[PDB]
UniProtKB/Swiss-Prot annotation, chain A:
Protein name as catalogued: V-type proton ATPase subunit d
Pfam families per the UniProt record, alphabetical: vATP-synt_AC39
InterPro entries (alphabetical): ATPase_csu/dsu_sf (IPR036079), ATPase_V0-cplx_csu/dsu (IPR002843), ATPase_V0-cplx_dsu (IPR016727), V-type_ATPase_csu/dsu (IPR035067), V-type_ATPase_csu/dsu_dom_3 (IPR044911)
Protein's organism: Saccharomyces cerevisiae (strain ATCC 204508 / S288c) (Baker's yeast)
Subcellular location: Vacuole membrane
Curated annotation (Swiss-Prot), chain C:
UniProt GO molecular function: ATPase binding; phosphatidylinositol-3,5-bisphosphate binding; proton-transporting ATPase activity, rotational mechanism
The encoding gene: VPH1
Coiled-coil ranges per UniProt: 115-143
Vacuolar side: 392-393, 455-502, 562-604, 666-686
Record's protein name: V-type proton ATPase subunit a, vacuolar isoform
Cell location: Vacuole membrane
Record's miscellaneous remark: Present with 55714 molecules/cell in log phase SD medium.
Organism: Saccharomyces cerevisiae (strain ATCC 204508 / S288c)
Transmembrane spans: 373-391, 394-410, 425-454, 503-522, 541-561, 605-624, 641-665, 687-725
Single GO BP term: polyphosphate metabolic process
Curated annotation (Swiss-Prot), chain D:
GO molecular function: proton-transporting ATPase activity, rotational mechanism; RNA endonuclease activity
Protein location: Endoplasmic reticulum membrane; Vacuole membrane
CC annotations in GO: endoplasmic reticulum membrane; fungal-type vacuole membrane; Golgi membrane; proton-transporting V-type ATPase complex; vacuolar proton-transporting V-type ATPase complex; vacuolar proton-transporting V-type ATPase, V0 domain
Bilayer-spanning residue ranges: 7-27, 51-69
Species of origin: Saccharomyces cerevisiae (strain ATCC 204508 / S288c) (Baker's yeast)
Highest taxon in the source lineage: Eukaryota
Protein name (database record): V-type proton ATPase subunit f
UniProtKB/Swiss-Prot annotation, chain E:
One BP term from GO: Golgi lumen acidification
Location (main, coarse): membrane
GO MF: proton transmembrane transporter activity; proton-transporting ATPase activity, rotational mechanism
Residue numbers marked as site, Essential for proton translocation: E137
Taxon lineage: Eukaryota, Fungi, Dikarya, Ascomycota, Saccharomycotina
Misc note: Present with 8450 molecules/cell in log phase SD medium.
Family matches, as CDD domains: ATP-synt_Vo_c_ATP6C_rpt1, ATP-synt_Vo_c_ATP6C_rpt2
SUPFAM superfamilies named among the record's database cross-references: F1F0 ATP synthase subunit C
Keyword Acetylation: no
Record GO cellular component, one term: Golgi membrane
Protein name: V-type proton ATPase subunit c
Length: 324, 200, 758, 69, 155
């Protein structure tokens, strides 16, 4: 059964992760942050939440939206690194694979050369070498071959999306092989959503480039999830936004949610739906993925509110994405 | 597709099938005489295996439920240490499972007596050997099952109580059902061994 | 006099404070250092960022931030705070007549704001010069190398000791089969800004022949945090560079000594007073955080505060506020308006040094409902004595008593002394451990155990046969009964385990039933006190009938079976556990008649216990359905089913008294046989040496394994019996902690809190 | 020499003196709990003497460590 | 030999003596290893909690102590011409204590790991840790009790 063997290693981990899940800001707490009138007031109000005294070392004059975002991200990353440190075996590898996505993001962001690592979870020993790796030819055989991204590799957006294709395919395979049934299903669905988001975004990026051949996207579209293979192939053959709409007309989910409204808002909303659903499984490691995404969205919302009270423009303060 | 455990399973299955066919074809099928194995085998092996497996499987189930629910409630207790004393009833009902096995082991140990060689393999001694063996297995396995179930349910209860204290109450009913399962196992073991005489 | 609050929590009264706004700060100080008021949060539904005194807290919180930053700096430069008793002398911590800080808090705010910037400036100066210090030290270490050069051109520098491996690999993929590399480990670590701590470092050198690839090597080495250095191509130029570096170090040290001396002087001036500053600012911030919970009536210009105070202390509150108003001379009403309320008052238990530990252990499970029976008062005796029943050895009980007395006799010395955590836990439980030791000595006397061995202080009730052959399996005869404790004739007998198990198992059942009944009668006393006759008739009476008619029947049955001389009567001794089983699984067919008409009484008790189930389910809810003018059916049905099942499971769980008693006895006997008794078999100086060493082993394992390793087992199981078996009978719990507003010595170790706790 | 070791050995040697003295007395008086079994040493006073000598060894340790307390 | 005392009768006694110490020692080893990984992970940050976090490995050790006790007691009941009754008594005692202490050691290891981690994150979880951990220890204790009850009937 699910929980018979789960708690041998992951019971403490999973309990602590849903403990954090209880600490996610509720809609009422987001409202309270919205009604704030200054960054110090937001600091105090957010200290009234489960964040506690994290900006306690920051004075109101040093306090800025950038510092608030950095401290929230640092708290999230410390919690994730605690859970990963307390993890072993299959869950440890699962969390390492979660980190590989941020590793790929860091690779793409740093090869742009200024651009630093900009993400603590994607750090690896040779990451800053990528700031100085102007020659893309030397990339793999010099830098990345030492990194866990070596199995994935075979303008920069091409490299980023190829790495994401290989990474998502490998991680779907790992989820299928090494993860128990409830967490297996939950993570497979979450990866279907992630690969669908990647495919849609990559198709809309190819919309702006004439050199985006349909077969070129085959190296780029993960072909994972509900869109696969059919809607993925249609997006590969798609030439414009009308092609994307025609491709997405063939699926139940994510239909009618790119023709209107903000696309990022809809992807984040569906992601929050999936994370909320994933939290319902009681002995599943997918709770970790749901927690990570929920916390990332929480940090985004907090930074959004911080901006809306630091630069005013409060008409936009209520457009944060939350299911809690 | 290969695994060493399944390889041995299939190997021993093949060996047993071949041996059975060899004995049957040669007219010596009655050599495989499980009934005579039950008759000749010492009743004390059955009785002491019953007691040992009763307490051992009761303890295995109790411990299995205990670490499931205890690890879950310690993890959930990191944010809410209040969860410990509230959900400790789960650990309690897991332990009661092993206490059932201990009680049954005491009752069955009351039956252990030195039977005379002239009366060693009588109807009564064989009956009580089988009775203690299977009653100990019944109580121990039911206790193992109930301990695992109560541990899973109490882990879920601890996590839900961490989410909200109002969700705890109705999961305690599930824990009560899990404990009733083990109580029924104990009483059925008592009934199975109720009419089993001492070794005489 | 002040009513004792150990049997039930102290009677609380809700007090509404009409405080004039001008005297609010002084009043808050007065009743905070008085220490008997727990304030109600009247502004609970007002967001904290818009609360009345938010800015006064914010400025003081900035001041506290600055003070903890100062403490961090002092730790950085290794200075110890004064931690003088001036604050302790000023704050009576039990005397309310102390004047508050005046305008000095504004001076604290100004001083702190200025001084923080001062420290930032000098820290930046010292840090920058230290950076160039480390850089030039690394440069010198590079230049001190007499010869580490081989082969066109080269680049060299220093790396952290871990990063050198990955940089070497990265360059080996930059130059494949063409890299030339050496490194030298620096003897000592050096301070790094990024880590704010010392790191081990390594000098390195690589050789190359192409300007583009030399630039690549430099650019790939600066990433991964190497500090690159230009080195002359000849020993003369390297010597010149070394001389220049040494002169620069001379000047750098010249300025560094003065900067560090001045900065450390400032930190030393800080240390002599920083503790008092932090105490004052903490008190003032707490004062404003209390004032927030007051309703600020602007039209009346008064803080309408509310708080819980014991009624016996109401007069003290009135007196102390009358004293402070006399100090201020305002002649204001300062209205202590006690008022009725429906709010649940806090659960205050007034505990001495003796009962404090027992109260802490009992209320660690949960805080009692307001003015319900306090479980800690029964716990004082029951917890140590269940521990003793499980522990039950006079040698180990004596060791535990000596350990506890080492804390109780020296009580004044370990108090007002730092105790860590484990030793603090031992000290706070010192009376708990004392009662454990004493009751364990009594129990071991009844168990007739001093370590493995038995006492022979009275004539045995068993007399062996007149004569026997060596090795003969003799049997004793009952010349009498042993006065107090187990007969020593049972020692070393091969059937000792049968009698000991019968005794200890029936003892566990009997004493567990008695303890459960005593605790359950607290339910009756609570219902009587709360005037809840409906709980008496619907819950107490049927639950009592069930519990007695099954398990108290078993209890009186055990004592009756001991009260009957079966061998003299000629009647078969009943199978008592079998009869208990048949009471349910086959009623009426009593196997061996214990007493006349046992079948009728047995079936009557069975029917009464069965009837008590519908009684429990129905009577309490149906009263609500009829008379309230049922919704509690679900709660009542789950409560009664768990009560009925918990009776059985608790009677079963009390067997752990016998379980731990038998395990402790067997472990002690086995340890005696394995460790010390071997020494008795050898003689001569080898025998003396074996006796000494084997006693050392025996005593080390007795203290470690038996007294400490297994005494904690018995005390944790007694905690189990109390939180689970004893208190669940009566303990409603889920009360409100008292924890009043009172000043304390908030040591600056709280700098760990609010900075490493989130 | 150190106060911690001095106290540890002082306490251990005090218990050694007391316990081995009472054990030696019980062997010397042929107490049944120590001599009554066939598996026990056959001659009480003989083993009592060596247990008494061990008690004196712990007495030496106790007095010495007291001199370093 | 005799019908009651076969030459193969001491096999069960010897194997029960071995089984007690073996299975209690594997239970204790699992407990010690899991809880020691927890302790070493925890005390890198907060070494001040060493003597709190040491409790689970200690309880694992007492499990093996119970196994040692049972193994010794059944060992001194062994004989060449011992009855088959006492042979299976010793087998039952050894098997009961071994399996019970094995399960108790597994539970102690897992609970002690989780507990030391939590009580390093949340100090109020120490009493919870230790009170669950004693409840895991008591299962090996119950197995010890059954082994003692059985061994009391060996001859």
């Amino acid at each position: 059964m699910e929980g018979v063997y789960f708690n041998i290693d992951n019971g403490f981990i999973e309990g602590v992760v849903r403990g954090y899940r209880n600490g996610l800001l509720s809609n009422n707490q987001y409202i309270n942050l919205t009604q704030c009138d200054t960054l110090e007031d937001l600091k105090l109000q957010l200290s009234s939440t489960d964040y506690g005294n994290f900006l306690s070392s920051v004075s109101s004059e040093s306090l800025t939206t950038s510092l608030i975002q950095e401290y929230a991200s640092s708290k999230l990353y410390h919690e994730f690194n605690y859970i990963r440190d307390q993890s072993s075996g299959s869950t440890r590898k699962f969390m390492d694979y979660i980190t590989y996505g941020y590793m790929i993001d860091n690779v793409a962001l740093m090869i742009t050369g200024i651009l630093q690592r900009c993400h603590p979870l994607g750090w690896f020993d040779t990451l800053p070498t990528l700031s100085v790796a102007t020659d893309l030819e030397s990339l793999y055989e010099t830098v990345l071959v030492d990194t866990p991204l070596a199995p994935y590799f075979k303008n920069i957006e091409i490299i980023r999306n190829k790495l994401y294709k290989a990474y998502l395919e490998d991680f779907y395979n790992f989820v299928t092989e090494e993860i128990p049934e409830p967490a297996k299903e939950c993570m497979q669905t979450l990866l279907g959503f992630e690969a669908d988001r990647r495919s849609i975004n990559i198709a809309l990026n190819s919309l702006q480039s004439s050199d985006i051949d349909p077969d070129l996207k085959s190296d780029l579209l993960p072909n994972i999830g509900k869109l696969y293979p059919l809607a993925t192939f249609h997006l590969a053959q798609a030439q414009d936004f009308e092609g994307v709409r025609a491709a997405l007309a063939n699926v139940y989910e994510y239909r009618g949610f790119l023709e209107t409204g903000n696309l990022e808002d809809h992807f984040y909303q569906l992601e929050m739906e999936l994370c909320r659903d994933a939290f319902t499984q009681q002995f599943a490691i997918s709770t970790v993925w749901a927690w990570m995404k929920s916390k990332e969205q929480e940090v985004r919302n907090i930074t959004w509110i911080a901006e809306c009270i630091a630069q005013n423009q409060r008409e936009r303060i209520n457009n944060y994405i939350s299911v809690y | 597709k290969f695994s060493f455990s399944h390889f041995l399973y299939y190997l021993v299955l093949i060996v047993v099938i071949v041996y059975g066919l060899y004995k049957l074809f040669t007219g010596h099928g009655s050599d495989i005489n499980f009934g005579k194995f039950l008759l000749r085998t010492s009743p004390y092996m059955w009785a002491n295996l019953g007691i040992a497996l009763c307490v051992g499987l009761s303890v295995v189930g109790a411990a299995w439920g205990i670490f499931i629910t205890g690890s879950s409630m310690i993890g959930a207790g990191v944010r809410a240490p209040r969860i410990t004393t509230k959900n400790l009833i789960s650990i309690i009902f897991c332990e009661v499972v092993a206490i059932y096995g201990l009680i049954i082991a005491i009752v069955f140990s009351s039956k252990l007596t030195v039977a005379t060689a002239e009366n060693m393999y009588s109807k009564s001694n064989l009956y009580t050997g089988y009775s203690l063996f299977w009653a100990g297995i019944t109580v121990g396995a039911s206790n193992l099952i109930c301990g695992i179930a109560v541990g899973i349910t109490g882990a879920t209860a601890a996590i839900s109580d961490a989410a909200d204290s109002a969700l705890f109450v109705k999961i305690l009913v599930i824990e009560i059902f899990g404990s009733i399962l083990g109580l029924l196992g104990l009483i059925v073991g008592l009934l199975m061994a109720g009419k089993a005489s001492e070794f005489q | 006099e002040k009513e004792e609050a150990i049997f039930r929590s102290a009677e609380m009264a809700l007090v509404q404070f009409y405080i004039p706004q001008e005297i609010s700060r002084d009043s808050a100080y007065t009743l905070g250092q008085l220490g008997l008021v727990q304030f109600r949060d009247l502004n609970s539904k007002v967001r904290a960022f818009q609360r009345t005194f938010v800015n006064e807290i914010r400025r003081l919180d900035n001041v506290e931030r600055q003070y903890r930053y100062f403490y961090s700096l002092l730790k950085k430069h290794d200075i110890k705070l004064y931690e003088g008793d001036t604050d302790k002398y000023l704050d009576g911590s039990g005397e309310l007549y102390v004047p508050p800080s005046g305008s000095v808090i504004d001076d604290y705010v100004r001083n702190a704001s200025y001084l923080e910037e001062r420290l930032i400036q000098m820290e930046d100066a010292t840090d920058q010069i230290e950076v160039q210090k480390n850089d030039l030290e690394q440069y010198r270490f590079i230049l001190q190398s007499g010869d580490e050069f081989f082969l066109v051109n080269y680049v060299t520098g220093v790396i952290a000791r871990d990063k050198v491996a990955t940089l070497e690999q990265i360059l080996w993929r930059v130059l494949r089969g063409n890299l030339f590399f050496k490194t030298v480990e620096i003897e000592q670590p050096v301070y790094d800004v990024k880590t704010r701590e010392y790191k081990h470092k390594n000098a390195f050198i690589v050789f190359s022949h192409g300007d583009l690839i030399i630039k690549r090597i430099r650019k790939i080495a600066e990433s991964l945090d190497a500090n690159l250095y230009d080195v002359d191509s000849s020993n003369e130029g390297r010597s010149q560079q070394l001389a220049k570096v040494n002169k620069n170090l001379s000047d750098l040290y010249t300025v560094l000594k003065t900067t560090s001396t001045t900065l450390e002087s400032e930190l030393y001036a800080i240390a002599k007073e920083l503790d008092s500053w932090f105490q004052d600012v903490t008190r003032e911030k707490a004062i404003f955080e209390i004032l927030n919970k007051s309703n600020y009536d602007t039209n009346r210009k008064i803080l309408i505060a509310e708080g819980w105070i014991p009624r016996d202390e109401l007069a003290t509150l009135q007196a102390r506020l009358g004293e402070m108003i006399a100090r201020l001379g305002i002649d204001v009403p300062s209205i202590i308006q006690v008022l009725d309320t429906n709010h649940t008052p806090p659960t205050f238990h007034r505990t001495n040094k003796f009962t404090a530990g027992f109260q802490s252990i009992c209320d660690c499970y949960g805080i009692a409902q307001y003015r319900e029976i306090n479980a800690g008062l029964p716990t004082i005796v029951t917890f140590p004595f269940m521990f003793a029943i499980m522990f039950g050895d006079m040698g180990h009980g004596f060791l535990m008593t000596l350990a506890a007395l080492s804390l109780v006799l020296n009580e004044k010395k370990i108090n007002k002394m730092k105790r860590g955590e484990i030793f603090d836990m031992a000290f706070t439980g010192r009376y708990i451990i004392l009662l454990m030791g004493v009751f364990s000595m009594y129990t071991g006397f009844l168990y007739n155990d001093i370590f493995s061995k038995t006492m022979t202080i009275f004539k045995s009730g068993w007399k062996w046969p007149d004569h026997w052959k060596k090795g003969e399996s003799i049997t004793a005869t009952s010349v009498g009964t042993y006065p107090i404790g187990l007969d020593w004739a049972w020692h070393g007998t091969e059937n000792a385990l049968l009698f000991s198990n019968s005794y200890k198992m029936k003892l566990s059942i009997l004493m567990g039933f008695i303890h459960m009944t005593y605790s359950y009668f607290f339910s009756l006393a609570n219902h009587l006190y709360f005037n809840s006759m409906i709980d008496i008739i619907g819950n107490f009476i049927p639950g009592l009938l069930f519990m007695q008619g099954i398990f108290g029947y078993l209890s009186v049955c055990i004592v009756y079976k001991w009260a009957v001389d079966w061998v003299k009567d000629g009647k078969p001794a009943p199978g008592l556990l079998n009869m208990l089983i048949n009471m349910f699984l086959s009623p009426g067919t009593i196997d061996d008649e214990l007493y006349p008409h046992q079948a009728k009484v047995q079936v009557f008790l069975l029917l009464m216990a069965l009837v008590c189930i519908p009684w429990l389910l129905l009577v309490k809810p149906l009263h609500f359905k009829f008379t309230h003018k049922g919704d509690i059916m679900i709660h009542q049905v789950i409560h009664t089913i768990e009560f009925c099942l918990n009776c059985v499971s608790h009677t079963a769980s009390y067997l752990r008294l016998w379980a731990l008693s038998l395990a402790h006895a067997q472990l002690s006997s086995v340890l005696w046989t394995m460790t010390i008794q071997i020494a008795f078999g050898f003689r001569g100086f080898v025998g003396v040496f074996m006796t000494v060493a084997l006693f050392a082993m025996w005593f080390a394992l007795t203290c470690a394994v038996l007294v400490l390793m297994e005494g904690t087992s018995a005390m944790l199981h007694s905690l189990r019996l109390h939180w689970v078996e004893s208190m669940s009978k009566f303990f409603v719990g889920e009360g409100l902690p008292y924890e009043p507003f009172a000043f304390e010595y908030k040591d600056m170790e709280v700098a760990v809190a609010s900075a490493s706790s989130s | 020499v150190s106060t911690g070791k001095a106290w540890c050995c002082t306490v251990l040697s005090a218990f050694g003196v007391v316990i081995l003295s009472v054990i030696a007395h019980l062997f010397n008086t042929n107490h049944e709990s120590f001599v009554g079994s066939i598996n026990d040493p056959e001659d009480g006073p003989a083993v009592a003497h060596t247990v008494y000598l061990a008690a004196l060894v712990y007495l030496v340790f106790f007095v010495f460590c007291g001199f370093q307390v | 030999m005799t019908e009651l005392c076969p030459v193969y009768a001491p096999f069960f006694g010897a194997i029960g003596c071995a089984s007690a110490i073996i299975f209690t020692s594997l239970g204790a080893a699992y407990g010690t290893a899991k809880s020691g990984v927890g302790i070493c992970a925890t005390c890198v940050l907060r070494p001040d909690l060493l003597f709190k976090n040491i409790v689970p490995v200690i309880m694992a050790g007492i499990i093996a102590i119970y196994g040692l006790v049972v193994s010794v007691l059944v060992c001194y009941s062994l004989g060449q011409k011992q009855a088959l009754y006492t042979g299976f008594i010793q087998l039952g005692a050894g098997l009961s204590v071994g399996l019970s202490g094995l399960a108790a050691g597994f539970a102690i290891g897992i609970v002690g790991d989780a507990g030391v981690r939590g009580s390093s994150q949340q100090p109020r979880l120490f009493v919870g840790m230790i009170l669950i951990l004693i409840f895991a220890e008591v299962l090996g204790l119950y197995g010890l009790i059954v082994a003692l009850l059985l061994n009391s009937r060996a001859t």
